């Protein structure tokens with residue numbers, strides 16, 4: 001069998017606060033299953049150190065979904081409870097195979113929609129400017145589909161080496177730090193005031209592929225979800 005992610009110590013904190021959704025939003029593994037050696041080609045320990053996610057198909061996923069710690073049920077929190085909700089990661093985004101066009105690697109999501117997606121995208125115009133092979137944040141400030149519902153940002157060009165991300169939510173404001181540099185500073189999340197169902201996700205969620213068989217692949221050297 002492939003080497004289980006839980007066979008080393010590095011990811012036990014987040015696995016203790018997560019369920020795995022694969023290949024859809026349906027449950028693949030409970031937190032205890034993840035802590036107890038759940039493994040497959042979709043989710044395995046890579047190079048002896050990376051929690052790697054693989055998924056093919058339009059809107060299919062291999063994603064960790066934040067849970068109440070120590071075997072609890074699905075968590076939900078508010079963007080303005082006065083604390084800081086923080087997701088931190090270190091991610092190696094390899095060159096994606098042909099047919100893979102956008103891969104969501106971290107999210108904030110609620111009962112209704114994604115407040116935030118951090119995704120790799122092959123090519124995209126943002127605010128009149130073309131970018132290629134880069135990491136993007138997409139923030140919802142509305143629930144519609146038109147441009148004004150989103151704030152989209154070039155976070156960084158994709159690197160060969162590990163890229164660190166810190167997502168901070170405090171007092172209805174979102175900060176994203178990339179390789180130690182603040183890139184998004186205090187994006188307004190006020191539209192979500194009143195919502196108590198937010199949670200982190202991370203892994204690989206495949207968006208608008210050109211081929212249903214092309215497999216997205218994302219490696220995490222680190223991932224943690226904390227409340228301060």
Ligand SMILES: O=C(O)[C@H]1O[C@@H](O[C@H]2[C@H](O)[C@H](O)[C@H](O[C@H]3[C@H](O)[C@H](O)[C@H](O[C@H]4[C@H](O)[C@H](O)[C@H](O[C@H]5[C@H](O)[C@H](O)[C@H](O[C@H]6[C@H](O)[C@H](O)[C@H](O)O[C@@H]6C(=O)O)O[C@@H]5C(=O)O)O[C@@H]4C(=O)O)O[C@@H]3C(=O)O)O[C@@H]2C(=O)O)[C@@H](O)[C@@H](O)[C@@H]1O
Nearest residue numbers: 021025026065074107109112113114138140150205207208
């Ligand atoms: O490209 C463009 O055209 C535009 O795209 C825009 O971004 C898009 C993006 O491309 C992508 O489409 C994205 O997809 C969203 C999607 O719209 C939807 O919100 C989806 O929701 C998922 C959740 O992520 C989550 O997995 C959730 O999980 C649920 C399960 O569905 C199920 O309810 C489950 O039930 C069990 C639980 O135990 C329950 O508590 C219950 O008690 O028991 C059951 C059980 O035991 O069975 O509970 C799960 C849970 O954990 O909560 O399921 C939903 C789902 O509907 O499947 O999330 C994806 C996403 O991951 O982001 O949407 C983006 C968008 O609309 O913004 C923009 O980029 C735009 O600019 C472009 O133009």
